[PDB]
Write a protein that binds this ligand. Structure first.
Ligand code: APR
Ligand code: APR
Lengths: 157, 165, 165, 156
């Protein structure tokens, strides 16, 4: 059904734990595991939906960035639906790679071919404009999670 | 949704070997995509991307001057994109060109490539390069090694027919 | 289906990965050739050549020490000969070894090869060398690129089934 | 049903993957995580514990805390402990020697003298629970098939 992409250190114990509880209550079966691997690519291609959980340090990991590039690639050629969650990060900081998010991104770019960099850069610009859920704009995390889990469930029908 | 999509540098092969290959196809009931049949009024680059996505097989007819055309390189990058994500089968024809000469974009082929990179971001440029890196390692048909081109075409059309599953 | 001939260096893989591979085959109804089932009193090398000639597919499981054994190279030379003259399908598995280390007769694999060549007519040496050259350019399965070997085995056993139809 | 304790770097990609496929074919559902307390509860609640021992198992104090908890549950609860000696000899486990022992003493340097010996007693004890030694088996595939059937049978 769904492939969540996240930076575990930011969200594993906190918001991500609750999200996975929402899914199971609703019967949604998520897939949980610069390297990526051919098996990880295969799992992304075989997911109808991909949830992009963006966080302060998501761009500090080139594994998380390679996942983003594949999801956007699967959005284009396959019919993959991409849903975005902006967790204590502003979408414009993502589109323009600024704030602390940007400081982490440019560090993941030090000593990197200019061609990898912009494949990532292009992906962040694009994903930042996919309508999603911004935590700062929501009344409480619990209601936000419940809204996301119902939307994903509906889309899976 | 088409049967086979040929990628070629027409100035090198359009009038000659491509014509015979397509005559073999029609003889055997194979349905190629013919760019000359794009309805006038339409944007050409959008019809090519859509035609690639819909091709079960893609025939990349590589030639000495293939990389002089950004049309030919943009197509190759799209085909490799469809090979990985879709189930597209990619078949290669090396027409009077050496496989490693394309892989490293050196020799006479390379001088043609580096010229087409002028006024292009280094990232688009290398999106072409990886496509050339990858496609150069797909085992295919080398024209220089054949004694009679007509028989080669018959061998190619038979391989395509069998693969059409 | 049935006929498959596995070529492997037993010390590297017999007890481990090879055992799992053969278990996948039987699960899917594939009937491989088991050297351990040669009739006793027979001559091993004559039973091996006959078994290769009779296999639709050959699985070459390459490993660091594959070239340390002239049994593994003599079989490889016979496999390539049967691919050319018969229709034998040759599938490659690179097990914790790099394809160019096989192609360039180098790395730890190469030093194991160069010792097995000592005291051999120059004719044995290059019959083996080209076989390594040839098999190294056949697209196959690289173990290092896989994180869960069990899934790799499942992918291999499924491809063999398909190819047999 | 079953709690496997392992040093991922040694066995994740190889033997453990085949074991886990064997279990699933037989309908056994192991507990996979992806020091502790939620983990202790999961061990406390596992009918069987499979100790997959490897050379570097003792290089991780996280793996050693798991062994001490498993042995604790064998004693007070009814936990069945299944042992797998993977390219390591049980007596090297019993006496903490070889490369296995060399990793243990490094995991013990700069470590409380009290942790060390509860670990030692656990290794000494687990090394004497009859299990499956890889060196003694004819092919890894048949061994795994034997283990999954014994675990399956015991689960009834
Ligand atoms: N609207 C048009 N725009 C451009 N060229 C046009 C147009 N209409 C007709 N043409 C003709 O097409 C010619 C270019 O044809 P080629 O030189 O054969 O093409 P090339 O640049 O080598 O690559 C063309 C590409 O088209 C695809 O169908 C094919 O796979 C190949 O990659 C032009 O010189 C022109 O005569
Ligand atoms: N005549 C014999 N009778 C019984 N056992 C024998 C005999 N000759 C050898 N063996 C046994 O075979 C062992 C060597 O087997 P491997 O380590 O697998 O040897 P390797 O050189 O890797 O041979 C692998 C080769 O066998 C072929 O079936 C296969 O295609 C591959 O090329 C020896 O230790 C020995 O026990």
């Amino acid at each position: 059904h769904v492939f969540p992409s996240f930076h575990g250190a930011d969200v594993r114990k906190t918001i991500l734990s609750h999200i996975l509880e929402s899914f199971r209550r609703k019967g949604i079966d998520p897939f949980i595991d610069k390297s990526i691997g051919h098996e990880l690519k295969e799992a992304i291609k075989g997911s109808k939906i991909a949830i992009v959980l963006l966080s302060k340090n998501y761009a500090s990991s080139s594994w998380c960035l390679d996942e983003l590039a594949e999801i956007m690639k699967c959005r284009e050629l396959l019919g993959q639906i991409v849903m975005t969650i902006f967790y204590e990060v502003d979408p414009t900081d993502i589109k323009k790679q600024t704030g602390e998010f940007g400081k982490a991104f440019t560090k993941t770019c030090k000593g990197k071919t200019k061609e990898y960099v912009e494949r990532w850069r292009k992906a962040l610009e694009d994903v930042a404009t996919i309508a999603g859920y911004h935590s700062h704009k929501w009344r409480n995390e619990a209601d936000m999670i419940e809204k996301i889990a119902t939307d994903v469930s509906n889309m899976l029908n």
